[PDB]
Amino acid sequence: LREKAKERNPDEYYHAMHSRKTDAKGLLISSRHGDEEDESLSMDQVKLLK
Amino acid sequence: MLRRQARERREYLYRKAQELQDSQLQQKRQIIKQALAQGKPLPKELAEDESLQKDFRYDQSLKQVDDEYAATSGIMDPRIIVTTSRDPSTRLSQFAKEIKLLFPNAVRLNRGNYVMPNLVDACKKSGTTDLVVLHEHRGVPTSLTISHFPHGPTAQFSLHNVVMRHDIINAGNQSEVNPHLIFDNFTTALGKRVVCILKHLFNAGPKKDSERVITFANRGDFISVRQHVYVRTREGVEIAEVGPRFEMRLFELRLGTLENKDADVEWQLRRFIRTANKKDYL
Amino acid sequence: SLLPPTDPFRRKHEQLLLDKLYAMGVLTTKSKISDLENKVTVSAICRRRLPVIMHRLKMAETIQDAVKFIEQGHVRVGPNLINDPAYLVTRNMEDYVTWVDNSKIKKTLLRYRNQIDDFDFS
Amino acid sequence: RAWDLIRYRNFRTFTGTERIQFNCLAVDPSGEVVCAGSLDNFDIHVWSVQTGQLLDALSGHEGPVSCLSFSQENSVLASASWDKTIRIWSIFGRSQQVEPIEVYSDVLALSMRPDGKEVAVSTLKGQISIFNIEDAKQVGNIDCRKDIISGRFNQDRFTAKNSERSKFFTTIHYSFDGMAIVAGGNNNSICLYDVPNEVLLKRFIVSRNMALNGTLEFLNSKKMTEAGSLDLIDDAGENSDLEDRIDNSLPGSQRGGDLSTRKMRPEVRVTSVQFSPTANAFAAASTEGLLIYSTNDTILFDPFDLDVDVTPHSTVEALREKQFLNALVMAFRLNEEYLINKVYEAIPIKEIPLVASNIPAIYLPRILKFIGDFAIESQHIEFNLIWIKALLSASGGYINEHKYLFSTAM
Amino acid sequence: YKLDVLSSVHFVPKPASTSLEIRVETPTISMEDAQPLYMSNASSLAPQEIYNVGKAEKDGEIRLKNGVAMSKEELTREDKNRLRRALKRKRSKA
Amino acid sequence: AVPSVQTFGKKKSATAVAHVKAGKGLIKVNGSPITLVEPEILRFKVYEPLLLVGLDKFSNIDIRVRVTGGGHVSQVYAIRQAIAKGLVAYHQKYVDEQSKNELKKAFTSYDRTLLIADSRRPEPK
RNA sequence: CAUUGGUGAGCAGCGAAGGAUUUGGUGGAUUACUAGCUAAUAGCAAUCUAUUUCAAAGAAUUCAAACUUGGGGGAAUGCCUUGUUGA
RNA sequence: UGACGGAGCCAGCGAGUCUAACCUUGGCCGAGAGGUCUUGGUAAAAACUCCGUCGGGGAACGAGGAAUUCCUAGUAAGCGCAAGUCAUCAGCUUGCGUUGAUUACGUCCCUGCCCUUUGUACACAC
RNA sequence: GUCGACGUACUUCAUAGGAUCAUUUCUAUAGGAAUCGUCACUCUUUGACUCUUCAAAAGAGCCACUGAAUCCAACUUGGUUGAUGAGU
């Protein structure tokens, strides 16, 4: 792992960078509920659930 | 320049790996060069083998410094920095100074707060060929590492029976001329390697008249170093010693520089092996 | 090859041509001298072309996207940028191929790693 | 390689030490030291002219050297590299000390003042940053990325307002006065700035030639169709002759070799810009040759310090009643070339020295400029040489003080 | 040449060269390029290259490099010594 | 969205991230108003990117900073570099380029290290 | 306490017989404007043919002729060049 | 060239199911080994800013003579934290950050130390 | 410190027998199985075109005139004598 961090190449671009996020402290934030839409709800669904 | 240095590291390690894969093809090409010359039959392998025989014209055209130094062995005189550990002591500052005088083309340097990656970087970027960092123990020095910079080896030596010129005798002051070198009783392949590192640390192709030789005697795993000045009398040579006397001893030989701490290890001294004490260069 | 072996013209010209082609990058190693007729291929020259280098350096995802980003104009070699997918990049220019400045692809890398600095307008 | 220019010879060729590809040159005033730097090695090599060996390899950049120059007064070597830095090396005289300057980004041309106190540096983000060398400090930059006309190529798929192929100046040069910078680049425009006021004076367009690529701003939509663009088909088949059909072109060979060893149309660019050390002109080497741009006082009405009573009729009257000093200064105030010539030849040889003594300080540079412009192509060599002897003789030391306003005139 | 043009010149150069070549005395106007004016005049060899001074073709003389020649007879004996010393060390190196 | 611009400042081992978004004119540092940046002698080192360019340019934006690393003096120099780069970068983005130029001339004529990193990279002599 | 993350319910403010995003089609510009067709010194444009044919002029390389081929070995039979037997 | 309180305020390296004392006074249980509890004795971020307070030591000592050594920028010097890596290191050694300067940056005059005294290479000059 | 002779100890080599496929009929063998001018219908396999996802990136650019869509404002009609939501 330390050798990989040494040849990181700080110009690499992969396309899923548009979905995945990070911290202010650097290491990445992964959600506990799975998908890109599986974060939070809407008002019509929440009303029906209530 | 960072991306450059890294790219040639990646390349040269690769091309060495290839080399260790084609030593066996070296050997299959030597056989045919014997058998064409003096008529001897070939083995079944080389006999049936046709890639090789089809391109044994080109390879027939085919056919010592160490490899990290081969690029600039005789062209450029080196540039060395000699530097202390961190918060030194008065005795160590003297020792560093007179080591600087021992090597021509060495510039002393005081470390306070120069973290090691910044020291390696700044030397690399300014262009200094190699770096000597020295460690004490209450005044007595005890270690010395020497490391060669465009990504090349570091030898660590431990150093033992020390006497200092400045503190023994003020009979005068050192010649500071290109010295002669003597390398005695270095035989094994590792021994050749250590000869190569110390020898290329020294200076340019010195004159025939220079009266300052420096001896490095391998006596039994312990490298011993002394400085000498002389004359030629009509019956013999009158040798007057100068400079510090200390038994050096090699105990590690990494391949990166001295920051790396995970570079590959060519040779490391192993103390707790069952037959440690029996051999030499082990 | 048809000249005789112990002949310094032959030795000089093959050693010199190997070092030429290896610096260009169309053959990888400089030891075996049979590689001239053996491992010199249109495929080796193609894989020194420009989009493939991005793909190998991981500036892309696949050679189709490296080609696409070159053609849309995000890649530069030094100061001057390349629209040209068929550019052949010698080893020492492989050091210098990079993203252009203020492209949206450069901003995405930085914004992800969380190091945009807008004074650069990166 | 060094060249003589009286007997026409290489008297030396300094070489490398491993043969790298050299990309910029800089040489001392007392021409005994030559530095060159490449895009290959990022170490400035320094050779000595006489003994053709190399004194030194001044090292310390991290990234290839893009320009070098010599301050010709104080003799310092200021160099600049894609490092994003400038380094001012002081090579002669026990020092060997060096001083770096960080610029914001990736510098790519340099220009030293005549005076030797200032370095102007043209970077990749589009400024000209003008620094002071004794200090290390930035005494002014001028922001340029806008007033630069980058066109669209036919082989482009992106608008010219985004095409950052050419939004910077790869060449720069001060005046010989210390007041203007001409800069020129990889684009269709040469821009001429003024250095104190930081505001530009004119923008020149190198060409309008739709058989070059970077030259239109907006292409034509009648051309682009379903196939693709329409100037980009091949028509070598249409040609009636074998050598006009044959199309050698090694694929993607961006700017080397002969013109049809590439299948792309030329791009307008200014390869390098300089001022003129004697006249009011400048010259810029570009795709179609060296554009030489120059000036006429004999067309523009640019008077100096006028008043109501100063007409061509009045100065002629001042001649015909012989107040030759006043007639001359009225000519210099009105600033009209025929008039100055007229009085210049009216006044007589006995009266030349008193007039030359009594001229004013403000009009001295103009009279020198006029004598130069008349002098190289006229015939009155006694008239001109009597004038010059009187002018230097009576006002030498003043010129000696103000050495730089008079660089070109003298 | 093809490989330079393909690689869009950024190569690595040749190793080296040093090869002798011959130049002729010729006037500079006869050297330059054809157009109504001219620019330079002086001859293409230098005066030192048409007559340097070297050792005298008799034996009775010693001739130095600054163009002064002296017979063997008309030197005092100490000077004959000292000139022998000078030629001794000069040809001792070369 | 919001008009928002992020810049970074840096002295020996400190760091300081400024987010500048258009708002009503507050300045805060680690969740406290700027008027309590602590070492109290160097408070005017922090106030000088404000009082070199007048308060109104900050009357119309909401600058909010976070630092870490280093000691007292280093965090002071990181805060003011980040603020100065923040104000001139926002001005290039969401107002005119001319006022970008006037800002940067002010900060550079007074003290160029409001804008560029003062990196005392070593020297082997 | 933040949110510089969504989805909504509401004000202040703006505010002339309404407003806000998205998209199809055609016209004009994108280079500096001298009109259409033909067998063309003229006719036609409602039509070129029931004068549209004549006369004159017009025939080197006696065949220069793939400047047009990825590299290495070859070629039975082809092709090609040089010789040859019988007409 | 400061003591003593409070109160604010900021680091960078360390992350192997492995990390760590010695005696003692007695009670209980067990056949013993030992087990359980009880009792006493000895070993192991700082600077900085802020607010109030204060104004010789239990016989050797009040910042260290002559001499010599070392030293040019995150340098000298202060200040703590962490590790312990096949040699060395615990009477300690190497790292890591944190505040951070005065004075030269010239000259060969002194003590030295080298060097060349053959333009040689090709202009021009000297 | 070196090569010769001898002594021992390892390492490595043959391929026979039967079949089918290779000649634009026939690979040599009679022990062998195929010569037909099309009409529908079912299931299956690859491809175009149009949209699209991971997941984005770039717009041959401007004005005019004209249609079309979606959401809010407004008005009209049905609506607590039950609107919309909602698994027999």
Short mmCIF file of N, CA and C in Angstrom, two decimals, chain D residues 118-190:
data_model
loop_
_atom_site.label_atom_id
_atom_site.label_comp_id
_atom_site.label_asym_id
_atom_site.label_seq_id
_atom_site.Cartn_x
_atom_site.Cartn_y
_atom_site.Cartn_z
N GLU D 118 15.53 45.13 -14.35
CA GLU D 118 14.19 44.60 -14.39
C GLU D 118 14.11 43.44 -15.34
N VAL D 119 13.26 42.49 -15.01
CA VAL D 119 13.07 41.34 -15.86
C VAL D 119 11.60 41.25 -16.10
N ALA D 120 11.18 41.13 -17.34
CA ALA D 120 9.78 40.95 -17.66
C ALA D 120 9.59 39.51 -18.06
N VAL D 121 8.55 38.86 -17.62
CA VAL D 121 8.50 37.42 -17.75
C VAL D 121 7.10 36.99 -18.15
N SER D 122 6.99 36.30 -19.26
CA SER D 122 5.72 36.00 -19.88
C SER D 122 5.31 34.58 -19.59
N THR D 123 4.23 34.40 -18.82
CA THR D 123 3.95 33.10 -18.23
C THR D 123 2.78 32.45 -18.91
N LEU D 124 2.45 31.22 -18.52
CA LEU D 124 1.45 30.45 -19.23
C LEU D 124 0.03 30.80 -18.85
N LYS D 125 -0.20 31.45 -17.73
CA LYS D 125 -1.54 31.88 -17.44
C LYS D 125 -1.88 33.17 -18.10
N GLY D 126 -0.94 33.81 -18.75
CA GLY D 126 -1.28 35.03 -19.41
C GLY D 126 -1.01 36.28 -18.63
N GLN D 127 0.10 36.39 -17.93
CA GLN D 127 0.53 37.72 -17.59
C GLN D 127 1.92 37.99 -18.09
N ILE D 128 2.28 39.26 -18.08
CA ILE D 128 3.66 39.69 -18.18
C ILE D 128 4.04 40.23 -16.84
N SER D 129 4.82 39.52 -16.07
CA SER D 129 5.13 40.03 -14.76
C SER D 129 6.48 40.68 -14.76
N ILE D 130 6.56 41.91 -14.29
CA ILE D 130 7.74 42.72 -14.42
C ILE D 130 8.34 42.87 -13.05
N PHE D 131 9.51 42.29 -12.84
CA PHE D 131 10.16 42.21 -11.55
C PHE D 131 11.35 43.14 -11.51
N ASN D 132 11.81 43.36 -10.30
CA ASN D 132 12.98 44.14 -9.97
C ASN D 132 14.02 43.20 -9.41
N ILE D 133 15.24 43.27 -9.96
CA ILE D 133 16.31 42.30 -9.71
C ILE D 133 17.15 42.55 -8.48
N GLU D 134 17.46 43.80 -8.16
CA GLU D 134 18.22 44.07 -6.94
C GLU D 134 17.44 43.64 -5.73
N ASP D 135 16.18 44.01 -5.66
CA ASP D 135 15.28 43.39 -4.72
C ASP D 135 14.84 42.07 -5.31
N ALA D 136 13.74 41.52 -4.91
CA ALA D 136 13.23 40.45 -5.72
C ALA D 136 11.77 40.70 -6.01
N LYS D 137 11.42 41.93 -6.26
CA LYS D 137 10.02 42.16 -6.01
C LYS D 137 9.32 42.68 -7.24
N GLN D 138 8.04 42.44 -7.30
CA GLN D 138 7.26 42.56 -8.52
C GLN D 138 6.76 43.97 -8.64
N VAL D 139 7.31 44.73 -9.57
CA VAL D 139 6.95 46.12 -9.60
C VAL D 139 5.84 46.37 -10.59
N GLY D 140 5.41 45.35 -11.32
CA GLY D 140 4.10 45.48 -11.95
C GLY D 140 3.77 44.36 -12.89
N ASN D 141 2.57 43.82 -12.95
CA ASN D 141 2.35 42.91 -14.05
C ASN D 141 1.26 43.46 -14.91
N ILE D 142 1.13 42.94 -16.11
CA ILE D 142 0.02 43.34 -16.95
C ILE D 142 -0.72 42.09 -17.40
N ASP D 143 -2.04 42.07 -17.20
CA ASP D 143 -2.85 40.91 -17.51
C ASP D 143 -3.32 40.87 -18.95
N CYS D 144 -3.03 39.78 -19.65
CA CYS D 144 -3.16 39.82 -21.07
C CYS D 144 -4.13 38.87 -21.69
N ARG D 145 -4.56 37.81 -21.03
CA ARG D 145 -5.26 36.71 -21.67
C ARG D 145 -6.41 37.11 -22.57
N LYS D 146 -6.86 38.34 -22.50
CA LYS D 146 -8.05 38.72 -23.21
C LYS D 146 -7.74 39.30 -24.57
N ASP D 147 -6.76 40.17 -24.68
CA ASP D 147 -6.63 40.94 -25.91
C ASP D 147 -5.81 40.22 -26.99
N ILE D 148 -6.16 38.98 -27.19
CA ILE D 148 -5.39 38.01 -27.94
C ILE D 148 -6.38 37.29 -28.79
N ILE D 149 -6.10 37.18 -30.08
CA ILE D 149 -7.10 36.75 -31.02
C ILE D 149 -6.75 35.32 -31.38
N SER D 150 -7.28 34.36 -30.66
CA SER D 150 -7.11 33.00 -31.11
C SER D 150 -8.27 32.55 -31.99
N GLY D 151 -7.93 32.06 -33.17
CA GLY D 151 -8.88 31.55 -34.12
C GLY D 151 -9.18 30.08 -33.93
N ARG D 152 -10.04 29.57 -34.78
CA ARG D 152 -10.47 28.20 -34.67
C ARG D 152 -9.77 27.49 -35.81
N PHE D 153 -9.37 26.25 -35.59
CA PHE D 153 -8.84 25.50 -36.68
C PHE D 153 -9.97 24.77 -37.39
N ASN D 154 -9.76 24.44 -38.63
CA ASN D 154 -10.69 23.57 -39.30
C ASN D 154 -10.73 22.19 -38.70
N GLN D 155 -9.64 21.70 -38.20
CA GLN D 155 -9.67 20.41 -37.57
C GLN D 155 -10.06 20.46 -36.07
N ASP D 156 -10.60 21.57 -35.57
CA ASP D 156 -11.03 21.71 -34.19
C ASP D 156 -12.44 21.29 -33.99
N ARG D 157 -12.70 20.69 -32.85
CA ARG D 157 -14.07 20.48 -32.42
C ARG D 157 -14.37 21.27 -31.14
N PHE D 158 -13.82 22.44 -30.95
CA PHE D 158 -14.15 23.23 -29.79
C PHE D 158 -14.01 24.70 -30.11
N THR D 159 -14.89 25.51 -29.55
CA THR D 159 -15.02 26.91 -29.93
C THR D 159 -13.73 27.66 -29.74
N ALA D 160 -13.53 28.75 -30.48
CA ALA D 160 -12.30 29.49 -30.23
C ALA D 160 -12.29 30.19 -28.89
N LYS D 161 -13.42 30.60 -28.36
CA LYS D 161 -13.39 31.20 -27.05
C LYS D 161 -12.97 30.22 -25.97
N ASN D 162 -13.05 28.92 -26.19
CA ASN D 162 -12.44 28.00 -25.24
C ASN D 162 -11.08 27.52 -25.63
N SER D 163 -10.72 27.58 -26.90
CA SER D 163 -9.50 26.91 -27.36
C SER D 163 -8.31 27.55 -26.71
N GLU D 164 -7.75 26.89 -25.71
CA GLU D 164 -6.57 27.45 -25.07
C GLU D 164 -5.31 26.95 -25.67
N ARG D 165 -5.33 26.77 -26.94
CA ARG D 165 -4.11 26.59 -27.67
C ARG D 165 -3.21 27.78 -27.62
N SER D 166 -3.74 28.94 -27.49
CA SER D 166 -2.91 30.08 -27.75
C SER D 166 -3.24 31.32 -26.96
N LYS D 167 -3.64 31.21 -25.72
CA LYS D 167 -3.93 32.38 -24.94
C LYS D 167 -2.73 32.92 -24.17
N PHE D 168 -1.50 32.75 -24.64
CA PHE D 168 -0.32 33.29 -23.96
C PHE D 168 0.73 33.75 -24.95
N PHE D 169 1.72 34.48 -24.44
CA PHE D 169 2.74 35.12 -25.24
C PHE D 169 4.03 34.37 -25.11
N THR D 170 4.48 33.74 -26.16
CA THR D 170 5.69 32.98 -26.00
C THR D 170 6.95 33.76 -26.29
N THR D 171 6.86 35.03 -26.68
CA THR D 171 8.01 35.86 -26.97
C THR D 171 7.76 37.27 -26.48
N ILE D 172 8.82 37.94 -26.08
CA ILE D 172 8.68 39.22 -25.42
C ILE D 172 9.94 39.99 -25.72
N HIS D 173 9.85 41.31 -25.71
CA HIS D 173 11.06 42.11 -25.81
C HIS D 173 10.81 43.52 -25.36
N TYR D 174 11.65 44.04 -24.48
CA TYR D 174 11.59 45.46 -24.22
C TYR D 174 12.05 46.29 -25.37
N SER D 175 11.71 47.54 -25.26
CA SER D 175 12.27 48.59 -26.05
C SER D 175 13.73 48.76 -25.76
N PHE D 176 14.33 49.68 -26.47
CA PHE D 176 15.68 50.11 -26.20
C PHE D 176 15.70 51.36 -25.39
N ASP D 177 14.55 51.77 -24.96
CA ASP D 177 14.31 52.95 -24.19
C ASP D 177 13.92 52.56 -22.77
N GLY D 178 13.29 51.41 -22.61
CA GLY D 178 12.77 50.98 -21.34
C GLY D 178 11.31 51.24 -21.16
N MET D 179 10.55 51.44 -22.23
CA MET D 179 9.18 51.87 -22.05
C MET D 179 8.17 50.96 -22.69
N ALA D 180 8.52 50.15 -23.66
CA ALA D 180 7.47 49.38 -24.27
C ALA D 180 7.87 47.93 -24.24
N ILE D 181 6.89 47.06 -24.31
CA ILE D 181 7.16 45.66 -24.52
C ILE D 181 6.36 45.24 -25.73
N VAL D 182 7.00 44.61 -26.69
CA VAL D 182 6.27 43.94 -27.74
C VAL D 182 6.18 42.51 -27.35
N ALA D 183 5.02 41.93 -27.44
CA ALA D 183 4.98 40.53 -27.18
C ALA D 183 4.25 39.87 -28.31
N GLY D 184 4.62 38.65 -28.60
CA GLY D 184 3.94 37.94 -29.65
C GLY D 184 3.92 36.46 -29.37
N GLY D 185 3.00 35.76 -29.99
CA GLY D 185 2.83 34.40 -29.55
C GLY D 185 2.51 33.32 -30.54
N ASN D 186 1.78 32.32 -30.10
CA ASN D 186 1.18 31.32 -30.94
C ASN D 186 -0.19 31.70 -31.47
N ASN D 187 -0.46 32.97 -31.69
CA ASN D 187 -1.77 33.33 -32.15
C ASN D 187 -1.66 34.35 -33.26
N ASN D 188 -2.77 34.97 -33.61
CA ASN D 188 -2.93 35.87 -34.72
C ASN D 188 -2.62 37.30 -34.38
N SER D 189 -2.16 37.61 -33.18
CA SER D 189 -2.00 39.00 -32.81
C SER D 189 -0.68 39.25 -32.13
N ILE D 190 -0.08 40.38 -32.43
CA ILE D 190 1.08 40.92 -31.74
C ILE D 190 0.58 42.06 -30.88
#
